[PDB]
Amino acid sequence: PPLPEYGGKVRYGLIPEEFFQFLYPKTGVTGPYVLGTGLILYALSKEIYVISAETFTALSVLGVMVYGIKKYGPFVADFADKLNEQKLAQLEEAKQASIQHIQNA
């Protein structure tokens, strides 16, 4: 069975487009965003999210992750695609080779 060609259309690497489409009818385009900002402000206002040293280690590792992704993402995607293309080319070559061998026989 062949795989699809694209994934699930995530936004910001965290939330899929299905959520934005699901809130589009009742709360429009800014609905999900005001829900997100409201939840963030309620979390860090009622001190559900306690600001500590882990906030800054979190910001550091998230910055390193976003930078590393934006930088070495094209390279890793192209590397995987080229690995698959080389394997496919080698396989097609080795199939035609045996066809030619039996035709020669």
Partner 1 sequence: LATFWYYAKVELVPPTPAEIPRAIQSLKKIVNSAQTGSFKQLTVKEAVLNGLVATEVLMWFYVGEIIGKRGIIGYDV
Partner 2 sequence: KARIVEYEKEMEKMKNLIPFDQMTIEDLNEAFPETKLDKKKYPYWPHQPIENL
Partner 3 sequence: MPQLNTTVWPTMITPMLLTLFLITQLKMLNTNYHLPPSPKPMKMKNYNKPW
**Binding of residue 98 to partner 3 (CB under 8 A):** yes
Q: Which of 10, 15, 34, 80 binds partner 1 (CB under 8 A)?
A: 34
Residue linked to tokens 């009622």 = 46
Contact pick of 3, 4, 5, 12 for ligand CDL (by CB under 6 A): 12
Shortest CB 95 distance to ligand CDL, Å: 28
Please give the radius of gyration of the chain, using alpha carbons only, rounded to the nearest integer: 24
Q: Do 9 and 16 contact (CB within 8 A), yes or no?
A: yes
103 binds partner 2 (CB under 8 A): yes
